């Protein structure tokens, strides 16, 4: 029961799952959802539909706090990124900005064998 009414909607997409974290303007989270919060268990969590449901459940959780405006911040390349965007884009929440903050190193660490070359 905070009555935020404006905040930041983080989107963490990956080829395995898409997870939405909705925060106050300072960045502290209020509620959240993901593919596993909804009944999806296995690989289905990495779906654009699973993402859509996750972002909608996040937006509906945040409506209970009476939030209206969000700034969206996407991190990670992966399915359901743009579908979670479009889920929030008309979720009832007004999207004030979309920003891609996907972290890239400056050749910092050695990736797994999976990601080499």
């Amino acid at each position: 029961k905070r009555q935020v009414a404006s905040g930041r909607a983080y989107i963490h997409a990956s080829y395995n799952n898409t997870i939405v974290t909705i925060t106050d303007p300072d960045g502290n989270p209020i509620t959240w959802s993901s593919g596993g919060v909804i009944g999806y268990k296995g690989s289905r969590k990495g779906t654009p539909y699973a993402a859509q449901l996750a972002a909608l459940d996040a937006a509906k959780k945040a409506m209970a706090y009476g939030m209206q405006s969000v700034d969206v911040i996407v991190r990670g390349t992966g399915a359901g990124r743009e579908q979670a965007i479009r889920a929030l884009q008309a979720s009832g929440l007004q999207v004030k900005s979309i920003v891609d903050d996907t972290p890239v190193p400056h050749n910092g660490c050695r990736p797994k064998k999976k990601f080499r070359k």
């Binding site: 999806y40 289905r44 779906t47 654009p48 539909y49 699973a50």
Partner: protein, 155 residues
């Protein structure tokens, strides 16, 4: 049809109502090339529609057809070594073929004694939203959109 588009056949009009949909239904009733038996069945059933319903049997016919047509269906696809049930839309003609075929396949599962009775009772039931045909449409549209996760495998 690998080369051309396989154009559709144009059906002769109904000899009674002058409607191609009626004649298509007769042809889905036909069996071992018995046209007269299928039309005898169907028309004897149109007389059953009346004096039970006070409406023109043609209206009941096309209305039940409309309530059986599906909007979604699930088609398989071989992906990543496994096989997936993928929803997608139903082309209009396919909604036609599937609704009519289902109507016949439902009527012949009914317990009424003779054919035209089964056909009349199924046409009426499906017109008001019940009966085995509409259960086929509901089962299929249940299948589709239960796989919404695979909606991106449309093709």
């Amino acid at each position: 049809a690998r080369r051309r588009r396989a154009e559709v056949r144009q059906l002769q009009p109904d000899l009674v109502y002058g409607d191609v949909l009626v004649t298509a239904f007769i042809n889905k009733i036909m069996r071992d090339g018995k046209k007269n038996l299928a039309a005898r069945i169907f028309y004897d059933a149109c007389k059953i529609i009346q004096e039970k319903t006070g409406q023109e049997p043609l209206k009941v016919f096309k209305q039940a057809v409309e309530n059986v047509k599906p909007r979604m269906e699930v088609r398989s696809r071989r992906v990543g070594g496994a096989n997936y049930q993928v929803p997608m839309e139903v082309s209009p003609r396919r909604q036609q073929s599937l609704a009519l075929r289902w109507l016949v396949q439902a009527a012949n599962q009914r317990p009424e004694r003779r054919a035209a009775v089964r056909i009349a009772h199924e046409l009426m039931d499906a017109a008001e939203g019940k009966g085995g045909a509409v259960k086929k449409k509901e089962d299929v549209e249940r299948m589709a959109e239960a796989n919404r996760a695979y909606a991106h495998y449309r093709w």
